[PDB]
């Protein structure tokens, strides 16, 4: 069954990395709050910030472990430590020069990225000093992910599996003890993270070490093997990640609005990417391995099949998930960031932020499954074109929208977008006569959409008898913000049962058990 591979030991590490993140954003709000230091450090923290969520959610291992793991098969683990010397190499000497690059073209790079920084001199040369802190980050976290995916070829898992925890432990610990010895004191989260990143490599090189896998770097252009693993890395980011770079160009944009425009949408974003990157991951680690797997032995019945589950499963989780966060996106805002130097119109402007990222979670999470469809027969071409056209609307619609709703329309373009590239997905698959999804959709859709109303009539009405919800101490928030959790999943779900649907037979499909037997006894 392939869902085995969920519940296989990091299942308590994705709680522990969730939970450790969140106490970052949470003490960094304490401390900070959302105005001019937080917004010059949130711009100084995009690229790295996007690196960070790829090699969290094993992203690049689900793309490179395949490659690697071929040519460890075929063609020797005395080749592959050269494949790996010649990949790590054009990595580093490529990423390197970016780095420097950028280091010594800081301000240049935030006049693009933040060009309304440039009415706040003091502001800027900030934002650009930060910048250049953590630039090294972008080299390191991506020898971090290259040396995760050699140890996951290998079969070890839980070294790679821990290392993201290491950059939250870096900047709690640089947030609260490093901070007052700095000024201004943000600066200690810029070297938290570049800190961050030297931990989470040094961390993984002694066990790459015990299996030989460490190799000095070297270049040579000559393998083509080595120039389409890094060449396709951008593409096959982009064709999975759109929302995730317009955050980066929405930036832009944003760098004109009121104070803390970049931090309420990073606050917002953060919130959203709980049921976003749990969900994703989950989807992505049963999907792209067995789809492959089918495509690959022409298992044509077994690819259509694990498609339709995997969908079911999207609109299963994240339609409640979406309608949760938009309900309780004020209580999430207060109970979890509403501290210390982060206040109530803080709070408020996350929370409009939160509500127009919420209609695009569903199409983030379809995302995830159909984009692997195309990946799977090896086709980058066509999620990429989609992402083009996805970008380029992100933009007209933030035209549209930034007058009348500001950072949160900049933030509900990037929700409709989402939902846009997902169905440009569906409709190419239909198109292209790759799926055909099974029958009884229809039905299917309804019952969640009941059921859907069914739990927000009882998170409404939980909300209703519960006290105002900056009410008391961070316990007294978090305990009364489980009570209405609680109440919302148990409404959810038992809707469905009385509706007929059951989950325990959903985990038990067949078409599950079968590939999962044809993908771990290759
Ligand atoms: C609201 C506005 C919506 C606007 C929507 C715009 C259209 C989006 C479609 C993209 C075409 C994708 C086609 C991808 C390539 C198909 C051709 C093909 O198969 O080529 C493979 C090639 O041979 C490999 O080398
Ligand atoms: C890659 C190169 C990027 C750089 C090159 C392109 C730069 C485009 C900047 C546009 C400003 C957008 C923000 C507009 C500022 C005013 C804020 C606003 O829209 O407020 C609404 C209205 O004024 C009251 O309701
Ligand atoms: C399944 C659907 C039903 C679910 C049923 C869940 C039961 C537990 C709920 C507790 C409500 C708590 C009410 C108020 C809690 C805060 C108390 C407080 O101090 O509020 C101020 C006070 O009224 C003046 O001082
Ligand atoms: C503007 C001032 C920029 C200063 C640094 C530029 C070169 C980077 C060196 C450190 C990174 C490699 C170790
Ligand atoms: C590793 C996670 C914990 C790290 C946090 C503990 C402090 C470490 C370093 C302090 C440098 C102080 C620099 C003082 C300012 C110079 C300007
Ligand atoms: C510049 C400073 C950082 C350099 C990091 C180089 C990576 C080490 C070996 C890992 C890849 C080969 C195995
Ligand atoms: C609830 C969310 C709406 C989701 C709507 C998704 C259903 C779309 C149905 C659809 O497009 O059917 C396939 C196509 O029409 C045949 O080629
Ligand atoms: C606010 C919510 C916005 C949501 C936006 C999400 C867009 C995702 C795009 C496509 C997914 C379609 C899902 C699958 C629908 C298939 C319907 C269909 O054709 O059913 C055939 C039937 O089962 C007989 O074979
Ligand atoms: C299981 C239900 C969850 C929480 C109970 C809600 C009541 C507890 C939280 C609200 C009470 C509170 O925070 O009280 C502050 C202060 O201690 C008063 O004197």
Redesign the pocket.
């Given at each position: 069954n392939l869902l085995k591979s969920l519940a296989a030991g990091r299942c308590s590490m994705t709680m522990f990395s969730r939970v450790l993140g969140f106490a970052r954003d949470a003490i960094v709000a304490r401390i900070f709050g959302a105005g001019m230091a937080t917004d010059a450090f949130f711009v100084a923290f995009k690229l790295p910030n996007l690196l960070r969520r790829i090699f969290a959610e094993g992203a690049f291992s689900q793309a490179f472990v395949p490659i690697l793991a071929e040519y460890k098969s075929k063609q020797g683990e005395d080749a592959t430590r050269v494949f790996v010397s010649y990949v790590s190499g054009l990595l580093t000497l490529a990423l390197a020069v970016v780095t420097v690059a950028g280091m010594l073209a800081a301000p240049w790079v935030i006049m693009v990225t933040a060009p309304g920084f440039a009415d706040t001199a003091d502001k800027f040369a900030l934002t650009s000093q930060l910048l250049k802190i953590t630039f090294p980050y972008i080299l390191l976290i991506s020898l971090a992910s290259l040396v995760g995916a050699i140890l996951n070829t290998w079969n070890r898992f839980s070294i790679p599996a821990f290392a993201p925890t290491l950059l939250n432990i870096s900047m709690i610990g640089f947030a609260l003890f490093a901070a007052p010895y700095f000024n201004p004191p943000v600066l200690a989260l810029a070297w938290a993270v570049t800190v961050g990143g030297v931990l989470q490599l040094v961390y993984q090189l002694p066990h790459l070490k015990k299996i030989g896998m460490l190799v000095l770097p070297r270049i040579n252009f000559h393998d083509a093997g080595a120039m389409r693993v890094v060449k396709q890395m951008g593409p096959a980011i982009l064709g999975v990640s759109v929302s995730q770079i317009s955050l980066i160009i929405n930036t832009i944009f944003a760098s004109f609005l009121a104070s803390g425009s970049v931090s309420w949408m990073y606050y917002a974003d953060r919130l959203m990417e709980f049921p976003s990157g749990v969900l994703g991951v989950a989807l992505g680690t049963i999907l792209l391995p067995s789809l492959s797997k089918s495509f690959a032995s022409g298992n044509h019945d077994e690819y259509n099949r694990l498609m339709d589950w995997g969908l079911r499963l999207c609109?299963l989780l994240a339609?409640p998930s979406a309608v949760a966060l938009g309900i309780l996106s004020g209580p999430l805002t207060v109970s979890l960031f509403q501290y210390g130097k982060f206040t109530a119109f803080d709070a408020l402007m996350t929370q409009r932020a939160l509500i127009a990222y919420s209609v695009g979670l569903?199409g983030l999470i379809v995302v995830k499954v159909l984009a692997p469809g195309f990946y799977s027969r090896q086709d980058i071409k066509t999620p990429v074109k989609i992402a083009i056209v996805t970008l380029i609307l992100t933009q007209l619609m933030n035209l549209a929208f930034i007058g009348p709703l500001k950072h949160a329309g900049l933030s509900l373009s990037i929700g409709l977008a989402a939902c846009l590239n997902a169905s440009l997905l569906?409709?190419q698959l239909?198109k292209q006569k790759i799926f055909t999804?099974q029958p009884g959709?229809m039905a299917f859709?309804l019952r969640?959409?009941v059921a859907v109303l069914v739990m927000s009539g009882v998170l409404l009405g939980m909300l209703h008898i519960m006290p105002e919800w900056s009410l008391g101490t961070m316990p007294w928030r978090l305990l009364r913000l489980m009570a209405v959790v609680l109440a919302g999943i148990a409404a959810y779900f038992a809707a469905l049962a009385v509706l007929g649907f059951k989950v325990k037979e959903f985990a038990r499909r067949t078409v599950l058990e079968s590939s999962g037997e044809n993908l771990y006894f290759q």
């Open positions: 609109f339609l569903i569906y409709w239909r999804p959709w859709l969640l959409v």
